[PDB]
């Protein structure tokens, strides 16, 4: 479901995508 395309992008900002 579409949540899986966002959630972390709002709930932090896609942590791990920065940090990786």
UniProtKB/Swiss-Prot annotation:
Q: Specify the protein name.
A: Hemagglutinin HA2 chain
Shown stretch of the complete protein: 330 to 349 of 550
Give the source species: Influenza A virus (strain A/Swine/Hong Kong/126/1982 H3N2)
